[PDB]
Amino acid sequence: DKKSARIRRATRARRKLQELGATRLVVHRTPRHIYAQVIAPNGSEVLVAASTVEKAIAEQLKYTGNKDAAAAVGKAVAERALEKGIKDVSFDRSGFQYHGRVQALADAAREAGLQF
Amino acid sequence: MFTINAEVRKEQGKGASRRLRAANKFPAIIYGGKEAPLAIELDHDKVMNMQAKAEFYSEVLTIVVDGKEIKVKAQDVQRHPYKPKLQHIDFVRA
Amino acid sequence: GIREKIKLVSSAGTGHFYTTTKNKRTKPEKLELKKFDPVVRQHVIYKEAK
Amino acid sequence: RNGRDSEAKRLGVKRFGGESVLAGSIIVRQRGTKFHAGANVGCGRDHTLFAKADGKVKFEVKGPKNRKFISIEAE
Amino acid sequence: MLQPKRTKFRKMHKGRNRGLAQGTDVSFGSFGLKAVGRGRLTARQIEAARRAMTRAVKRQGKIWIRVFPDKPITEKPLAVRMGKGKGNVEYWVALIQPGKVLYEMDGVPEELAREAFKLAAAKLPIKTTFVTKTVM
Amino acid sequence: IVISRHVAIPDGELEITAIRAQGAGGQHVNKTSTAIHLRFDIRASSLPEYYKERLLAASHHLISSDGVI
Amino acid sequence: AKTIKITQTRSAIGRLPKHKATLLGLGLRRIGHTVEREDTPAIRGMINAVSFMVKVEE
RNA sequence: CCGACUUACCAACCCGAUGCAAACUGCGAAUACCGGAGAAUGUUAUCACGGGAGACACACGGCGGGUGCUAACGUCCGUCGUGAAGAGGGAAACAACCCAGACCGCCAGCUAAGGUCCCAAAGUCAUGGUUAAGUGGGAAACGAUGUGGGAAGGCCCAGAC
RNA sequence: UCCUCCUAAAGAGUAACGGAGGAGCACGAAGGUUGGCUAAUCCUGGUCGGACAUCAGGAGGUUAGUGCAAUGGCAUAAGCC
RNA sequence: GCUCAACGGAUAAAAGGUACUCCGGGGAUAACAGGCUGAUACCGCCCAAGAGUUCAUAUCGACGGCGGUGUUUGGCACCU
RNA sequence: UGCCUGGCGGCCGUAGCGCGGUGGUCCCACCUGACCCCAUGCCGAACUCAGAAGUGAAACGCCGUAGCGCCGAUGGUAGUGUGGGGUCUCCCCAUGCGAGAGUAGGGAACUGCCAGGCAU
Ligand SMILES: [Mg+2]
Ligand SMILES: [Mg+2]
Ligand SMILES: [Mg+2]
Ligand SMILES: [Mg+2]
Ligand SMILES: [Mg+2]
Ligand SMILES: [Mg+2]
Ligand SMILES: [Mg+2]
Ligand SMILES: [Mg+2]
Ligand SMILES: [Mg+2]
Ligand SMILES: [Mg+2]
Ligand SMILES: [Mg+2]
Ligand SMILES: [Mg+2]
Ligand SMILES: [Mg+2]
Ligand SMILES: [Mg+2]
Ligand SMILES: [Mg+2]
Ligand SMILES: [Mg+2]
Ligand SMILES: [Mg+2]
Ligand SMILES: [Mg+2]
Ligand SMILES: [Mg+2]
Ligand SMILES: [Mg+2]
Ligand SMILES: [Mg+2]
Ligand SMILES: [Mg+2]
Ligand SMILES: [Mg+2]
Ligand SMILES: [Mg+2]
Ligand SMILES: [Mg+2]
Ligand SMILES: [Mg+2]
Ligand SMILES: [Mg+2]
Ligand SMILES: [Mg+2]
Ligand SMILES: [Mg+2]
Ligand SMILES: [Mg+2]
Ligand SMILES: [Mg+2]
Ligand SMILES: [Mg+2]
Ligand SMILES: [Mg+2]
Ligand SMILES: [Mg+2]
Ligand SMILES: [Mg+2]
Ligand SMILES: [Mg+2]
Ligand SMILES: [Mg+2]
Ligand SMILES: [Mg+2]
Ligand SMILES: [Mg+2]
Ligand SMILES: [Mg+2]
Ligand SMILES: [Mg+2]
Ligand SMILES: [Mg+2]
Ligand SMILES: [Mg+2]
Ligand SMILES: [Mg+2]
Ligand code: NA
């Protein structure tokens, strides 16, 4: 399964971040609808979140599930994080390559201000 | 139609059960259903002569404990490793 | 065994050197690593010697 | 013919559960990871679990594989 | 003469023989010869007892041997000092605890089974008794 | 005790005694019964016929005139 | 408050080191020596440890 | 080529049942050990550092083992006890077993192990039973209408043995 | 002399001319990191081709692998690219 | 720069014979004899397949089992 | 507040597997296209990007079902610390601890944070 392959692909970095006690910006990519959350070091509760399934984000995107939608989600999640005071996060690919939409989201978060 | 008289065990465990089997009784347990298990003592001679019948392990038996008649069935029997004796019997209720 | 101890000399002016081993029978090409030279306090090329 | 053996390696648990250690204290010496490093516990090259903080040793069996972890409760 | 094929090791520690047996029921036949005593059964003793049984009963009836020696016993050669390594494996014994069913028999009357088991128990170093299969 | 695929001595037909040996050895050779004296009565044995016959007919230094090896 | 009198009735000669340490922790020196100790579960555990050689009166 | 026959032989895997393992473990104690807390007790019994050693031939007994022959007053380990270096009482006598640690004295008393007919101190004690073998006061497989007790069972005043 | 297992009595240690095996190296990648991947063995189908090569699928599940003994590890792989 | 591998490595550098022997010791340790043990040895018994014209048990007794003795050779190293 | 879905956890088989049924607004998955970002030791399979027509077939989720896996008493047994005893390289007694296996039975996980959709 692609899902299980990706989850085992993510497990190593996820456990490393849990060991480091880092607040992590977890990305989740889907053919449609990229997603981002900022999750506390305890890993059990979400600090902030932003996704193209949100109407306030999807209303300004002609397609949710592309690089522009990913950059929008990245800017949004980094803005909400900076407003809650979360500045130093670690990126979590969730087993996706740091190549396309995921890299666009991470870059948008970086320019918005999240340090990673 | 087998009837076995039994008393409830006051003390239980290794030393108590060994004292019992020395005094020519042997411990048994009754369990099954929602009622708690009941630890009983049986007269070894009586029950050993009874279980010699192959119907002891198929028929519904009755055990008289404190006057109460409990319909049971022989579930498991721990026999002596080499002596013709019984160490323990499990009785499922009904 | 058949592994000979060689000397990696710094390409800086320092006489500093690391020592390692080498299977010269299989790898007859000289080691050309980039190691830290504590005399100049930089990473410079160390080349195999005797 | 027989007659050969090895010097004993003095492996095993050095600090047990609830024991107060200093940072750097060796907790268990092992060959593989019989015990795994938990919070505030590092794993050396020979798989020695050592305390990375001052606290109390704590053993758990967390995880999907039910394997044993050693953490340092920062107490 | 029963003996394992290709064991892991050639020699083993003496060990002890504490405890009660595990195979204490007649599992394969109608009748059985159960050890009241504790000791060692060598393969030669097992084979002698099996021949006594197999002759007392004719070709009729089935016989199970419930015990395997699976344990090598060493001896030192005669006139050898103590030491110089463990001795050589001479024979194999089965360890026997009180209650172990050694042989089972089926397909014969109980009288023939009893006399066959007596003929065989005469060949064994261990005290035995006759048992039958019990329902439960 | 085996002589052939069909000939074996039952091991009780063989009298084996211990005696002192000749020659060097000191107190040990003086006192210790290291030499073996084997006696085998051919007629009293369960040896095959024609084997008893050949052994009794042979003139061997190991067979006495009484039919004992 | 509630006390208990413990007498040593047997010798400590060939006893286990833990048994001799228990007799010391109870304060018993001789055979027939009687001490009076507080009636706590710890003292009861000591009396249990060396019960084969001490007598208790409560 | 091909192929039903003869597979009544052996027979892998798998399934069901039965065992065995120091160098097997999908289980798993008691103890022991490590750590923390709390009393009470203990002449600090603990640790560190200094002065002085001696010792590094151990023995037996119990328990857990390797070896040996489930031999050795054998040998080799672990652990405890004793002797060593501990007298006294018991085991006839008997370092190491059992009881028990001798500061000295007493023609006082109570006890331990072990004992109480005489040697030889103390029950020819009491109650119930067993044993006739001097068993007690050496031994196995196995044998036997010895004898005591117990639980059943077969046949029996339509008569059993 | 060194390493691994057992003996070894569930902390450590623990003897014998006790039971069994190895070492006296290898590797500039067989190290570092990043990214990715997941075996054995069977069955079925398939040119040569075959008990066994390579291909496809299924079962299977690490019964594989770990540069070299054994043990303990190893999937987040410590295994493979 | 050391198979200093006898691997805490005594020298850079070293094999034998002694019945021609010697000394200091040792029953710490062998040879004799004693001791413990009893594998071995020897003797006895149990089972009974069989042999014995039938017939296990007149006589012998396979496969196996249980003991005794303390003559052997041993084991141990307790005495000397 | 309920139902459904997605993500991240707790927990690590009472939680897994099997068998049967079921879900497509949304979500998810398959899916469509690929010269491009990127990719194939060949291959748009995978990875990646651009999309969304179609389908819930598979997968995934949910709901049932014990056929298994798993959990699991009580009692007994085994073992065992201490003291004692015997017929003693094996046991027994007093006391303390007390399994494993099996049995009755349980059992088709439970739950936290966030987000979205539907019903309110
Ligand atoms: Mg918020
Ligand atoms: Mg007990
Ligand atoms: Mg070792
Ligand atoms: Mg000479
Ligand atoms: Mg002599
Ligand atoms: Mg004759
Ligand atoms: Mg004593
Ligand atoms: Mg084991
Ligand atoms: Mg010395
Ligand atoms: Mg010494
Ligand atoms: Mg011993
Ligand atoms: Mg000695
Ligand atoms: Mg000795
Ligand atoms: Mg001395
Ligand atoms: Mg004395
Ligand atoms: Mg005395
Ligand atoms: Mg005496
Ligand atoms: Mg005297
Ligand atoms: Mg004194
Ligand atoms: Mg008395
Ligand atoms: Mg008198
Ligand atoms: Mg009288
Ligand atoms: Mg007598
Ligand atoms: Mg240990
Ligand atoms: Mg231990
Ligand atoms: Mg490597
Ligand atoms: Mg990687
Ligand atoms: Mg084909
Ligand atoms: Mg060298
Ligand atoms: Mg040396
Ligand atoms: Mg040396
Ligand atoms: Mg030297
Ligand atoms: Mg001299
Ligand atoms: Mg001597
Ligand atoms: Mg001397
Ligand atoms: Mg001698
Ligand atoms: Mg005949
Ligand atoms: Mg002798
Ligand atoms: Mg000695
Ligand atoms: Mg003498
Ligand atoms: Mg659709
Ligand atoms: Mg479907
Ligand atoms: Mg229980
Ligand atoms: Mg249980
Ligand atoms: Na049952």
Curated annotation (Swiss-Prot), chain A:
Gene Ontology cellular component annotations, sorted alphabetically: cytoplasm; cytosol; cytosolic large ribosomal subunit
Any GO MF annotation of the entry: structural constituent of ribosome
Domain of life according to the entry: Bacteria
InterPro entries: Ribosomal_uL18_bac-type (IPR004389), Ribosomal_uL18_bac/euk (IPR005484)
Family annotation (SUPFAM superfamilies): Translational machinery components (SSF53137)
Domain writeup: The basic N-terminus is not necessary for binding to 5S rRNA. It is however required for cooperative binding of L5 and L18 to 5S rRNA as well as for binding of the 5S rRNA/L5/L18 complex to the 23S rRNA.
Family in the record: Belongs to the universal ribosomal protein uL18 family.
Quaternary data: Part of the 50S ribosomal subunit; part of the 5S rRNA/L5/L18/L25 subcomplex. Contacts the 5S and 23S rRNAs.
Protein name: Large ribosomal subunit protein uL18
From Swiss-Prot, chain B:
This protein's GO CC annotations: cytoplasm; cytosol; cytosolic large ribosomal subunit
Keyword Ribosomal protein: yes
InterPro entries from the UniProt entry: Rbsml_bL25/Gln-tRNA_synth_N, Ribosomal_bL25/Gln-tRNA_synth, Ribosomal_bL25_short, Ribosomal_L25_dom, Ribosomal_uL5_bac-type
Gene Ontology biological process terms from the UniProt entry: cytoplasmic translation; negative regulation of translation; response to radiation; ribosomal large subunit assembly; translation
Keywords, ordered alphabetically: Ribonucleoprotein, Ribosomal protein, RNA-binding, rRNA-binding
Protein family membership: Belongs to the bacterial ribosomal protein bL25 family.
Subunit organization: Part of the 50S ribosomal subunit; part of the 5S rRNA/L5/L18/L25 subcomplex. Contacts the 5S rRNA.
PANTHER family: RIBOSOMAL PROTEIN L25/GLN-TRNA SYNTHETASE, ANTI-CODON-BINDING DOMAIN-CONTAINING PROTEIN (PTHR33284), RIBOSOMAL PROTEIN L25_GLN-TRNA SYNTHETASE, ANTI-CODON-BINDING DOMAIN-CONTAINING PROTEIN (PTHR33284:SF1)
UniProt name for this protein: Large ribosomal subunit protein bL25
Encoding gene, per UniProt annotation: rplY
UniProtKB/Swiss-Prot annotation, chain D:
Alphabetically ordered keywords of this record: Ribonucleoprotein, Ribosomal protein, RNA-binding, rRNA-binding, tRNA-binding
UniProt keyword annotation of Nucleotide-binding present: no
GO-annotated biological processes: assembly of large subunit precursor of preribosome; cytoplasmic translation; cytosolic ribosome assembly; positive regulation of ribosome biogenesis; regulation of cell growth; ribosomal large subunit assembly
Name of protein: Large ribosomal subunit protein bL27
NCBIfam families (alphabetical): L27
Family membership: Belongs to the bacterial ribosomal protein bL27 family.
Annotated Gene Ontology cellular component terms: cytoplasm; cytosolic large ribosomal subunit
Quaternary structure note: Part of the 50S ribosomal subunit. Cross-links to the 23S rRNA. Cross-links to the A and P site tRNAs.
InterPro entries: Ribosomal_bL27, Ribosomal_bL27_CS
Pfam families per record: Ribosomal_L27
Domain of life: Bacteria
Gene Ontology terms, MF aspect: ribosome binding; rRNA binding; structural constituent of ribosome; tRNA binding
Keyword match Heme: no
UniProtKB/Swiss-Prot annotation, chain G:
GO-annotated cellular components: cytoplasm; cytosolic large ribosomal subunit
GO biological process: cytoplasmic translation; ribosomal large subunit assembly
Keyword Magnesium included in the entry's annotation: no
Pfam families registered for this protein in UniProt: Ribosomal_L30 (PF00327)
Keyword terms of this UniProt record: Ribonucleoprotein, Ribosomal protein
Miscellaneous comment: This protein is located near the guanosine triphosphatase center of the 50S subunit.
Family according to the record: Belongs to the universal ribosomal protein uL30 family.
HAMAP family associated with the record: Ribosomal_uL30_B (MF_01371_B)
Subunit annotation: Part of the 50S ribosomal subunit.
The protein's name: Large ribosomal subunit protein uL30
Species this chain originates from: Escherichia coli (strain K12)
Gene designation per UniProt: rpmD
